[PDB]
Design a protein around this ligand. Structure first.
Ligand SMILES: *CCC(=O)Nc1cccc(-c2c[nH]c3ncnc(Nc4ccc5c(cnn5Cc5ccccc5)c4)c23)c1
Length: 267
């Protein structure tokens, strides 16, 4: 447990380039130099002094993030606690899956798409087995190591509001469970099947709850056969217990991945 998370000194890593920024902070492409080696790594520097969280509480959450052991979930490699929290992770050179599918839309076939739905469902099922709720699953929070190998990221970062990815019960009661992660998974699948479309495009965040109450859901992507769409639709049921479990999401999308042209119709 304790040895799974490395406490990095400031001299062990060097920020080289910027990869992205937001309210959370900044991510850098970096070099980890512990030993005559140089490891390409990504370094997320969180915004300083957002909350009064103590160092012991931070490392306790980082230990959990360093303990994940699944091919489709990102693992925290190291942490550097200074004025800011700096999280060190291996570099995913193809970026987030949302930007990937938007840039490669013309060259993405049915096997790649269903293989992604399988891998995301496997990573989420592992998080649920670890009794961990993600709370922020979206195509922007899936990283691409190689085109056929993706990993879920940004779990547990909430500890220390994406309305359009949240289940109705999370919007109305701030309830977050593994079945509310299933809702976000269905939206994530919708993002992939539309090659990176924005869900409820133009609709303001304050109107999403009434849209869902009216029974409106994200429209069937053109390439999705009715089989794929009803699985996505089942993820968006009001009754969280009636939504699919991640375990059975792995099964059906695995079955569909055996014959992808039967379930996705791509030009
Ligand atoms: C979809 C648009 C987008 O997100 N672009 C983007 C922005 C910032 C960084 C990256 C990016 C590109 N390649 C990457 N490789 C590896 N990591 C990141 N970003 C990233 C995400 C999350 C993260 C870190 C570092 N620490 N965390 C949090 C974390 C890590 C492990 C486990 C749990 C939580 C870097 C990359 C793309």
């Amino acid at each position: 447990n304790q040895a799974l998370l490395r406490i990095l000194k400031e001299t062990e890593f060097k920020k080289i380039k910027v990869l992205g920024s937001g309210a959370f902070g900044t991510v850098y492409k970096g070099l980890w130099i512990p030993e005559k080696v140089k490891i390409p790594v990504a370094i997320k520097e969180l915004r300083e002094a957002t909350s009064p969280k103590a160092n012991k509480e931070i490392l306790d959450e980082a230990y959990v993030m360093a303990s994940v052991d699944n091919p489709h979930v990102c693992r925290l490699l190291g942490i550097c606690l200074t004025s800011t929290v700096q999280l060190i992770m291996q570099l995913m050179p193809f970026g987030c899956l949302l930007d990937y599918v938007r840039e490669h839309k013309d060259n993405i076939g049915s096997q790649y798409l269903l293989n992604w739905c399988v891998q995301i469902a496997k990573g989420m099922n592992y998080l649920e087995d670890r009794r961990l709720v993600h709370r922020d699953l979206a195509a922007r929070n899936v990283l691409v190591k190689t085109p056929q190998h993706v990993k879920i990221t940004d779990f547990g970062l909430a500890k220390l509001v994406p309305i359009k990815w949240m289940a109705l019960e999370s919007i109305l009661h701030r309830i977050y469970t593994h079945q509310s992660d299933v809702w976000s998974y269905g939206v994530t699948v919708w993002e992939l099947m539309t090659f990176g479309s924005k869900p409820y495009d133009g609709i303001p965040a304050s109107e999403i709850s009434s849209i869902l109450e009216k029974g409106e859901r994200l429209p069937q992507p053109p390439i999705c056969t009715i089989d794929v769409y009803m699985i996505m639709r089942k993820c968006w049921m009001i009754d969280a217990d009636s939504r699919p479990k991640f375990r059975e999401l792995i099964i059906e999308f695995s079955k569909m991945a055996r014959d992808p042209q039967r379930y996705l119709v791509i030009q």
